Design an enzyme around this catalytic site. Structure first.
Site, PDB file in Angstrom:
ATOM      1  N   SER A   1       0.815  -1.202   0.000  1.00 24.00           N
ATOM      2  CA  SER A   1       0.000   0.000   0.000  1.00 24.00           C
ATOM      3  C   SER A   1       0.849   1.253   0.000  1.00 24.00           C
ATOM      4  O   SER A   1       0.754   2.110  -0.887  1.00 24.00           O
ATOM      5  CB  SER A   1      -1.142  -0.003   1.007  1.00 24.00           C
ATOM      6  OG  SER A   1      -0.664   0.073   2.336  1.00 24.00           O
ATOM      7  N   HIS A  28      -2.418  -8.859   1.501  1.00 23.00           N
ATOM      8  CA  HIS A  28      -2.065  -7.589   2.094  1.00 23.00           C
ATOM      9  C   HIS A  28      -3.055  -7.217   3.183  1.00 23.00           C
ATOM     10  O   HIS A  28      -3.217  -8.035   4.081  1.00 23.00           O
ATOM     11  CB  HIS A  28      -1.674  -6.515   1.056  1.00 23.00           C
ATOM     12  CG  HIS A  28      -1.105  -5.236   1.595  1.00 23.00           C
ATOM     13  ND1 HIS A  28      -0.280  -5.200   2.705  1.00 23.00           N
ATOM     14  CD2 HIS A  28      -1.276  -3.953   1.168  1.00 23.00           C
ATOM     15  CE1 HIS A  28       0.047  -3.935   2.909  1.00 23.00           C
ATOM     16  NE2 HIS A  28      -0.537  -3.156   2.005  1.00 23.00           N
ATOM     17  N   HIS A  67       5.067 -12.993   6.923  1.00 22.10           N
ATOM     18  CA  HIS A  67       5.490 -11.639   6.591  1.00 22.10           C
ATOM     19  C   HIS A  67       6.694 -11.662   5.661  1.00 22.10           C
ATOM     20  O   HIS A  67       7.586 -12.499   5.755  1.00 22.10           O
ATOM     21  CB  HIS A  67       5.849 -10.773   7.833  1.00 22.10           C
ATOM     22  CG  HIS A  67       5.694  -9.286   7.658  1.00 22.10           C
ATOM     23  ND1 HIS A  67       6.736  -8.468   7.232  1.00 22.10           N
ATOM     24  CD2 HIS A  67       4.621  -8.482   7.907  1.00 22.10           C
ATOM     25  CE1 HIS A  67       6.265  -7.216   7.199  1.00 22.10           C
ATOM     26  NE2 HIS A  67       4.986  -7.193   7.589  1.00 22.10           N
ATOM     27  N   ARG A 121       3.024  -5.429  16.720  1.00 16.41           N
ATOM     28  CA  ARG A 121       1.673  -4.941  16.472  1.00 16.41           C
ATOM     29  C   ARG A 121       0.633  -6.010  16.899  1.00 16.41           C
ATOM     30  O   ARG A 121      -0.517  -5.705  17.279  1.00 16.41           O
ATOM     31  CB  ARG A 121       1.548  -4.550  14.992  1.00 16.41           C
ATOM     32  CG  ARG A 121       1.923  -3.124  14.619  1.00 16.41           C
ATOM     33  CD  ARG A 121       1.849  -2.923  13.114  1.00 16.41           C
ATOM     34  NE  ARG A 121       2.210  -4.110  12.339  1.00 16.41           N
ATOM     35  CZ  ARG A 121       2.050  -4.122  11.016  1.00 16.41           C
ATOM     36  NH1 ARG A 121       1.537  -3.054  10.416  1.00 16.41           N
ATOM     37  NH2 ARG A 121       2.383  -5.185  10.275  1.00 16.41           N
ATOM     38  N   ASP A 140      -2.598  -8.635  11.332  1.00 17.95           N
ATOM     39  CA  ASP A 140      -3.929  -8.969  10.907  1.00 17.95           C
ATOM     40  C   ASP A 140      -4.559 -10.161  11.616  1.00 17.95           C
ATOM     41  O   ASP A 140      -5.781 -10.384  11.537  1.00 17.95           O
ATOM     42  CB  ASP A 140      -3.993  -9.201   9.395  1.00 17.95           C
ATOM     43  CG  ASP A 140      -3.878  -8.018   8.473  1.00 17.95           C
ATOM     44  OD1 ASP A 140      -3.571  -8.195   7.310  1.00 17.95           O
ATOM     45  OD2 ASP A 140      -4.185  -6.835   8.973  1.00 17.95           O
TER      46      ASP A 140
END
Ligand SMILES: CC(C)(COP(=O)(O)OP(=O)(O)OC[C@H]1O[C@@H](n2cnc3c(N)ncnc32)[C@H](O)[C@@H]1OP(=O)(O)O)[C@@H](O)C(=O)NCCC(=O)NCCSCC[C@@](O)(CC(=O)O)C(=O)O
Ligand SMILES: CC(C)(COP(=O)(O)OP(=O)(O)OC[C@H]1O[C@@H](n2cnc3c(N)ncnc32)[C@H](O)[C@@H]1OP(=O)(O)O)[C@@H](O)C(=O)NCCC(=O)NCCSCC[C@@](O)(CC(=O)O)C(=O)O
Lengths: 429, 429
Positions: free
Chosen positions: A243, A273, A316, A325, A371
């Protein structure tokens, strides 16, 4: 004399940095930083140092840093609501300036994004007319594209401004865009999931996140805290992610900030993504349909793998360890929703997945990424519409891609236009 | 037994290529192909061999090749209408298969793109409601984004298909998308410039270009010939150009072919990229407002330069000589509109610009590129709406970006995710 103005600070900032980059280059431009291999070319630039992106740096082991600021460090240094989570407004200042903002600066962005939040009629119209089977990311992207009508940078360019002032108009459009985002996003949410209701008004006295949740129609005081953290942690992830890179590539050609952002979003909408947001929940959702044992948990995982599919939420391109995260998110469920059964599942998978991924011997990184943990949190709060998750990612990511975009243009970065080869051509090399 | 089917040919094609790429890699994956410099990183990958793109290769001196086929070679080898210009249908086959098509194959694509051309109601609706100050490229991009509702690849993915079959659904969506394009593009043209009129019907007996011009409402037999050439020459320009790379980057994440294309378009809309189409005409348009002498022609050029602006239509990131795509166009005006005063100006600039650009000592390539010559041609034919030119580029480019996209997925190319660095981080390296 006078008060707070980001643009003025930048004006002070640009020339120094410009000067700073010139001498460095004058001395080191010819310095080889790396090599390029055949595997690298077929491997999606994996391992290739290809871009300069200043707002954040991803460390393979430690993970993301905002200056050189880690998430835990941001968590303690960034101004809060009153009031445990960091305000995305502050992350923004931080990303833009390299410096930690005062609550006073923080308040300025808030008002600023409040005064600027306005949706033109042709946009409301389109969103209002969009079919319900039109994915929220699609709706999101068309909408931002459609806003380009309003580009200060597009107009100034058409007027023939000198290249030197580009950053100025980019900045205005970045601030406007950031401000309009929660309106667009909420409107989609209201349309699709709350038909007949309305987004309401933006209140200049609240922080962005708070006005957002109000627009989404959530009242829970803890939901607001969720939001602030969410939008802060999703900000930026260095420049190489699909992105961010897409916005960087598109911005390089001089397309305004609206157009570059929407392309960024077509990128985030991809399953490998941002969409993993969503894929994770629908995979859990399916998991549960088929309180399970690790052994059945593990059969389930293998069947996914065996079916030429990915296990969403793990893996990843750069990270080689658990995404901080992810940890950030876990520590939040731990505080706030520790007995939630979805939560527990997510905790249970943590114990299984990686081991199964190690067993398979394919994934370079068997650990979860951001995610894998996000949606669980949303669902708890009663936001169970999974096809909407990536929109949230969407709004946050703007903070990071627009922060850098203004720098690119400030620094005069040129058109991104590498060399491509064909297999024949490589075979011949 | 049986007749023509591209999909079947590809099915035969994929495994061989797959096998072909594996052994090459098994042997040479570790082979360094290049180095990466600091200047390269700040310079938008200028000079960096970053991608594998199979459909075309840009030579710095000779320019673009379709197999290893030059424009002049395509011009003679590609099936024509009846009837001097190469059919974009044939370029497509060529790009997809590496082989020169028969008129018979050529006819198949035509029918195929004819049967498939259908616009869903929600799309017509949106386009119909778009404001007139909304740029045609913007309208174009939102529309393609909005079509994603219809993705065969998006649906199949959501169903959980094995990765191995990806290319199959990509192909279907590529064919559908190519087919719908002239409908979307024409509808914008009809809306904005011919309010009240209608696009009409697609006729299965015509070639794509012909149905396109019919939809645009042009009757001139020479206009049709223009179109075919135009859409053929704009096809593809290797992988490193902003539009192609963006589709490649976005497609890598698994976003369907619709989403990747629309982002590609936000890219093409940039002034340093496709928009030069348009910028050129508006610069000429302005030139003329201010039969001139070279000396006044040269003052005009300097003022542009002196104003921190670019001279649209000159310069290239990879080409170092006059773009054969420019020559192709010139030879067409020479045949068909040699006395046109816009034409002559364009011929006159050719004599001046480069010399002025050499004088300035900044541009690495002082020669014109494809965009310097296109609009002149359009305007002659009575298509004088300059803000629409890039849409034409748009439709053509699809042929090349979708041709490769199906390969990427066939070959299993991974997520494009390079490493980025910050200035500090580089300073430290
Ligand atoms: C993330 C991902 C694409 C990395 O791709 P990669 O670098 O090419 O991975 P790899 O481990 O090197 O690949 C080796 C093999 O392992 C496979 N593998 C890797 N992850 C998985 C997985 N979760 N399940 C199954 N197989 C996997 C790869 O598909 C590959 O298979 P083949 O050779 O047959 O294709 C991959 O791990 C995956 O597909 N994961 C599942 C989807 C997912 O969780 N997506 C999350 C991405 S996070 C989004 C955001 C980001 O953090 C992104 C960033 O910084 O780039 C940011 O904030 O922007
Ligand atoms: C094309 C262009 C961006 C190349 O950029 P570049 O590779 O960074 O150029 P360069 O010559 O190496 O740059 C050195 C300096 O010369 C300047 N210069 C180059 N071209 C021009 C120009 N026409 N006028 C004024 N100055 C110029 C650069 O701006 C730069 O300035 P600074 O150092 O202060 O920024 C540049 O020549 C330009 O801006 N041209 C004007 C706009 C234009 O004509 N655009 C046409 C692009 S063709 C689109 C398509 C393509 O052919 C693209 C492709 O293959 O990539 C395809 O089919 O997709």
């Amino acid at each position: 004399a006078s008060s707070t103005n980001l643009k003025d600070v930048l004006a002070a900032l640009i020339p120094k940095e410009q000067a700073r980059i010139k001498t460095f280059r004058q001395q080191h431009g010819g310095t080889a930083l790396g090599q390029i291999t055949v595997d690298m070319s077929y491997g999606g630039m994996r391992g290739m140092k290809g871009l300069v992106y200043e707002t954040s740096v991803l460390d393979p082991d430690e993970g993301i840093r905002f200056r050189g600021f880690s998430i835990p460090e941001c968590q303690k240094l960034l101004p809060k609501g009153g009031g445990g989570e960091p305000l995305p407004e502050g992350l923004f200042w931080l990303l833009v300036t390299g410096q930690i903002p005062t609550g006073a600066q923080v308040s300025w962005l808030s008002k600023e994004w409040a005064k600027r939040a306005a949706l033109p009629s042709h946009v409301v119209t389109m969103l209002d007319n969009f079919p319900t089977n039109l994915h929220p990311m699609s709706q999101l992207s068309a909408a931002i594209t459609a806003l380009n009508s309003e580009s200060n940078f597009a107009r100034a360019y058409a007027e023939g401004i000198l290249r030197t002032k580009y950053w100025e108009m980019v900045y205005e459009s970045a601030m406007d865009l950031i401000a309009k985002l929660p309106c667009v996003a909420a409107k989609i949410y209201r349309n699709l999931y709350r038909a007949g209701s309305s987004i309401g008004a933006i209140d200049s006295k609240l922080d962005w996140s708070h006005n957002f949740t109000n627009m989404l129609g959530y009242t829970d005081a803890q939901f607001t805290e969720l939001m602030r953290l969410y939008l802060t942690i999703h900000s930026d992830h260095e420049g190489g992610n699909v992105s961010a890179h897409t916005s960087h590539l598109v911005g390089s050609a001089l397309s305004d900030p609206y157009l570059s952002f929407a392309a960024a979003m077509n990128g985030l909408a991809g399953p490998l993504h941002g969409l993993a947001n969503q894929e994770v929940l629908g995979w859990l959702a399916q998991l549960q349909k088929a309180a399970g044992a690790d052994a059945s948990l593990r059969d389930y995982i293998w069947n996914t793998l065996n079916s030429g599919r990915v296990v969403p939420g793990y893996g990843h391109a750069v990270l080689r360890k658990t995404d901080p995260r992810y940890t950030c998110q876990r520590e939040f469920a731990l505080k706030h929703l520790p007995g939630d059964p979805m939560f527990k599942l997510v905790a249970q998978l943590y114990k299984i997945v990686p081991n199964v991924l190690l067993e398979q011997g394919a994934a370079a990184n068997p650990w979860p990424n951001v995610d894998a943990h996000s949606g669980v949190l949303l669902q708890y709060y009663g936001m169970t519409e999974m096809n909407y998750y990536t929109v949230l990612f969407g709004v946050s990511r703007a903070l990071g891609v627009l922060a850098q975009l203004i720098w690119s243009r400030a620094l005069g970065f040129p058109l991104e236009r590498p060399k491509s080869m064909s297999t024949d051509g490589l075979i011949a090399l």
